[PDB]
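FAQ
Q: What does a multi-component entry look like?
A: The components come first, one per line:
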Amino acid sequence: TINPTNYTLLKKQAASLIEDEHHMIAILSNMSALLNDNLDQINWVGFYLLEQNELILGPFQGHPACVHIPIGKGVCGTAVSERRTQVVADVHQFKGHIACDANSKSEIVVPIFKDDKIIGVLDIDAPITDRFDDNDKEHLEAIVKIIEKQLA
Amino acid sequence: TINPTNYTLLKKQAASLIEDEHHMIAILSNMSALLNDNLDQINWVGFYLLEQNELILGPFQGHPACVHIPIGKGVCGTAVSERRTQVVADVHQFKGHIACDANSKSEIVVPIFKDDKIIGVLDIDAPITDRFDDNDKEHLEAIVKIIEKQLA
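Then the predicted structure of the entire assembly, as tokens:
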């Protein structure tokens, strides 16, 4: 059972923990908390930042995670190499999953852009399979757009 | 009722999410998770970084928090101005508490040093009063020392 999220109001709330803020780390830290507090059936939510040609762990809500993820490897790295959101119904069956993805049963990763360049990703993992659908994808991408506008 | 923490083993574990790592944000993000997973009766645990003469919210586990905290104000700001750990049994009775400290009933804030300069603080809040004692203070300061050594 997956309790639904009122994404319409969530977008407005996100705009708050973002507006008038220019410290990216603070924005990402608070955003990870906001999403964690409003999404049911998830076990990890946070960000990875592209630094020195690899993904580096940023602010998140959940258990400790791998710090480095290569571009093109793992669910997160693949989101970067494909330059598009990844909605994974079953991580164990995802072509390219790595040991660092072990605790994720289903997942969604949305790339974050800045001047046509991917600067990181929003990663949300779930303890059950098929947690995310097209509706979640649309709303989460919209939330990422709000973040992008603030960081721009 | 406060369940005890095996700080002796926790220090060893912390050394892990820290060793061979040079990205401070990743270190702080994972450390906030490690502490959250091993401390009972707390509602917020994370870091604030000193940037442009004020504290700026960094990685943490919990609900959204204030991004800016002035030096010398609030429990966290006071830890910086006094340049020493603050163990607060009752935040509501703490001289200098601010609106941003509202959800914290008791708290401990440990300043983090780098070349004799305070670069931030470790902040842990609890939903009950008198959560932290001298024993917690000693062990948490030791953990902060491990973080300092890695960032040095």
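Q: Is there any commentary attached?
A: Sometimes. For this entry: The interface with chain A takes residues 17, 21, 23, 25-26, 29-30, 33-34, 37, 46, 49, 51, 56-65, 67 of chain B (CB under 8 Å).
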